[model samples]
Target chain A: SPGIWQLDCTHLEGKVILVAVHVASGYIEAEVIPAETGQETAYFLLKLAGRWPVKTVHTDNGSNFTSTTVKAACWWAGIKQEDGIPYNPQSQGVIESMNKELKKIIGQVRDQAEHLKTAVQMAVFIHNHKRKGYSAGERIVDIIATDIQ
Target chain B: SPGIWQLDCTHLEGKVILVAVHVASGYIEAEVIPAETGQETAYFLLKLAGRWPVKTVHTDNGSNFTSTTVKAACWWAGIKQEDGIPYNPQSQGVIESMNKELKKIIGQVRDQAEHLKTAVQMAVFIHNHKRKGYSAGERIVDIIATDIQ
Candidate 1:
């Protein structure tokens, strides 16, 4: 299995975007957010669960995720919650690096289309298939997208 | 640098083929051969040299390579020659595995056109760009192709 699922957020194009990555598979998923509040964070987790099994979520130590609303969402979704090491960026290196990588691709596409949302989705597709290079495991992610409960 | 280039040969469709792979960059180059002799092998190295710097070649200790003629070719080409660990396939694992990969792609492409040479070239193009996935470094291989001394 591709280790655990990692979660992180970066602000891009005047909006907050949460990024999800599977360790070895190099698969990525992301969502745009209006706010960094707990309610918004909880809904994003549920939305991620709509696609992946997401048994556990590893994220930064932010109140937006540590609050009861987000914890309750994990409880209802049966996902375990964990936080990263304080003050060490390497602890969240996977998603952090991918965030940087994706934003670079998004920048290229966004410049051509002048549509931030469209560019972000296009970036996700290109990243999952291009950067680390495609393999059977990536196709597994695409296949499992249909088998989720 | 992406470690030493690894070389290996496999037979496909009544002809011999040579494959070269760089360790970390995941860049690949291959050539089809009319014979498995030292003369043919030497020519192929020069062909690869026409593109990359090719400082060192790590290959299995086969007569086609262990021969004095091949050693002289390496000497003339300014490339170092080294043999793989005896009885260990993993010593040549990188090119060995890529050999398996490109053939699979060639099979898929060759079926449609029934052209072995074109299919092999197409497979190399795809594998170098796709399988391990593209990074800035693969582009480095392309860039270095023009900068060789």
Candidate 2:
């Protein structure tokens, strides 16, 4: 639910990256995209559904989310789409907080890092692994993946 | 959901700050405190209720918020408390995003700034003013304050 720098290299450079977070396990998912368009949004969601079971998805009332392409994609995927109150961003807190941390990481390493993608990946890995002595990936494997089986 | 750090000239040192946001009009209220305790939480909410009419306040399931002291305060104020899903910080997106900008302000100026308190005050001012080409204070004066009269 966050978009990293579209122009500023003070953090990640070039078009914004979309990030999503799983609320229960703190699992992170992201895509480095060219823009925040409906097609791109739909693509991210479709790919996300393949990796994790997206029963419900919540987002702000943006055109990228509300467009017919995105809506149809969600419907096709059998994912429930919910929007937060207009102009209210806190209702989408999980990803928002994560995005904040990710931007911090980028800012800290912008001068040293050779690439934004690798830095983002490393940041996300650290974020998931550092929580409460359990990695988010481990939690997902133990709980979500196990439940599926 | 913004947290304020103390102005001790020390870096990254302090208990926490609780800040609330009114999603629709980008209004904000915040208080710096010694700790994120239930008592402090309640005190903040009480103060916030005095400034703005809160219909629904959503927060992460932190102990300070879930505790009886905070709950009672909300009940007394006739404000509805909605708990975002645990571990899902994005559900509280409005404040989380604001906190990010606030922290960035602090981080950028902590070394050069004479006082953290004043720097934060400046940041908050800019935040309120930059929204929709109108300051939040202006919106309050034009919309909220006028409505009262």
Candidate 3:
């Protein structure tokens, strides 16, 4: 099944960014979130669920993910949520890669705080196409485009 | 001499973007200004003068340029300021073309409000290089880069 999903978070200019990746495809969804709280993390997952399939969501064991709100969110969405081993970067390498690349693109834009969401969206769009059908996963660009259409 | 400077303004998200073009070279400077007021417009021209040579500044018959603030700014910079004939787009054709092409690039960036300045800067850089020293003006890309150094 193409439902494995990974979620992560990073900060930029004192703001938090929520990053989500579809494991079966190179598609990504990212947004400049207001905070990294339980409710916020739950909402981000709920958003991912709406965008595409979410059989499982892998995240770090931060309080944001450990909170009952997130557990409840996954329960209602019928999604399986798992936390990466504490201090184990390999467990979240998939999403860590995304975090690095997205930051690279946004940083190049130099003045991105105001348009952070759009810059992140464009970064995801650019990264998805880089695979060009030669990667381990399928391309998510067309799928997402058609979804937009 | 590339002393012929043309200035214009367009609105984005209710903010004013002041545009200046060097009529002899394909260099452009754009900024999302605070207001369409005389003081602000004068400061923009002063900033432009600081960035490069500004022998002459041509603008439409806007109160911003006609005011003494603008005149003082230009006089202090030892630059000439000229007002165009009302409704005479031909007199400002050089900068009208820049305004059009610039809008085209910024519009393509999609989510540009927060990163409007950086987006416009990149747009200007891209347009200046598009000439590749083939058009009427010299490329401003290398010139500006070295100036920054």
Candidate 4:
């Protein structure tokens, strides 16, 4: 089963910025957290599902992921958390592709210097119909289906 | 001299209309009237001094051409009206070409649809380019140039 979760942290400021992407599904969820403590990250992880069986949790070696709050939640749920290899951001290739495509379309319509989120939305609309290669994935998905009704 | 004023009624509604083609210069002038009556045609005729010459007017043998008002105006001004051949409207070939080129440029917008004018204004503009021919006629003293300039 595909599962998703965030890391633990304890020594960050209030109103923390939390950004997470689903590893298997290529979906992303983000929030402005009240604190960077491990307890805050742990609770944020549980917001993804009510009772679905989360087989594995993977995250970067951020201090928050190794914090005690996340560790205690993983212990109570009997789930194992693994830290990914350091310095290799390409391990999150899906999120990177999403970010790149979004920015390109926005650039064409606007003058130089715009928010990154504008490009992301533009790319999502443009690539909605673009298809993925069979060599890259086992299944074909409708790109437009993700953006338009 | 014989002149043909091949007029297009494609965009015309119920209106008094008169057209004069300069026999020597292949220029055309057109006017719209409220009614298809000889009185309206003659009114347009007497107003054609500086814009066009008074010599020969060519039209179909409609009742408007034969009406007393049209005949009186021609008689007073020493102008002659020649009725075009009954079924061969092609006698007004110069006016036909003007209308044709006008439509070719105006109807297509795929590449340059933005430059446009009212139908009457466009027709009058084409009429004033007196020296237009074979891509290199030096248009001078044309209707678009003189009094309107």
DockQ of each: 0.01, 0.01, 0.02, 0.01
Chain B TM, cand. 4: 0.59
Provide TM-scores for the models. 0.44, 0.41, 0.43, 0.35
Best by lDDT: 3
Q: After superposition, how far is residue B67 of candidate 4 from its true place, in Å?
A: 0.9
Stretches of model 4 off by over 4 angstroms after superposition:
A1-149, B2-17, B86-97, B102-118, B130-149
lDDT measured at residue A20 in model 3 versus the true structure, 0 to 100: 74
Q: Could you give candidate 3's fraction of true interface contacts?
A: 0.00
Please identify model 1 stretches exceeding 4 Å from their true place: A1-149, B1-3, B86-93, B131-149
* Candidate 1 structure quality by residue, lDDT tens digits, B1-149: 43266677788989877776665456666667776788667656644542345678876457856777678657755678877563565655655666788789888768643446546655665564463344423443433332331
- Name the TM-score of candidate 4: 0.35
lDDT of 3 at A83: 70
Instruction: Give lDDT tens digits, candidate 3, residues B2-112.
Output: 456777888776777887776555566667775787866776676565334467887744785679988976875668888755356565576666678888987875463
Residue A76 C-alpha lDDT in model 4: 43
Candidate 4 interface RMSD after superposing interface residues? 34.1
Give stretches of model 2 more than 4 Å off.
Answer: A1-14, A86-95, A109-113, A145-149, B1-149
TM-score of chain A of each: 0.79, 0.73, 0.77, 0.50
